[PDB]
Amino acid sequence: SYTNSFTRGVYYPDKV
């Protein structure tokens, strides 16, 4: 099956 990811999967960048 498949699904839509509206707005997710954004991790934090380097520790700044």
Q: Which residues bind another protein (CB under 8 A)?
A: 12, 15-16
As given in the structure block, the two tokens for residue 12 are: 């934090």
Q: Toward another protein, which CB reaches closer, 10 or 16? A: 16
DSSP state of 4: -
Q: Distance between CA atoms of 2 and 16, rounded to whole angstroms? A: 35
Q: Toward another protein, which CB reaches closer, 6 or 12? A: 12
Q: Toward another protein, which CB reaches closer, 8 or 15? A: 15
Q: How far is the CB of 16 from another protein (least distance, A)?
A: 5
